[PDB]
Design a protein around this ligand. Structure first.
Ligand SMILES: [Zn+2]
Ligand SMILES: [Zn+2]
Length: 56
C-alpha cells in the first residue's frame, strides 16, 4: 500500500481496529487492512471487514 492511500482511511486496520504503519496490502474496493488480519479474515469471511464486498 501507499502512504497517501493509508492516510486517506485513517491507515487503521478495521479488522482489529488498531493501526497500519507498515506491512499491509490494499483491496480493489479502497480498503487497506493488515496482511495478517486479511488472510485470516477471508479464511472465515469471504467479505471485506468493512464493505463486506466480495473481493476474492
Ligand atoms: Zn488488523
Ligand atoms: Zn472493501
Amino acid at each position: 500500500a501507499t502512504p497517501e492511500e493509508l492516510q486517506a482511511m485513517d491507515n487503521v486496520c478495521i479488522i482489529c481496529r488498531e493501526e497500519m504503519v507498515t506491512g499491509a496490502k490494499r483491496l480493489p474496493c479502497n480498503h487497506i487492512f493488515h496482511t495478517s488480519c486479511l488472510r485470516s479474515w477471508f479464511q472465515r469471511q469471504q467479505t471485506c471487514p468493512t464493505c463486506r464486498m466480495d473481493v476474492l
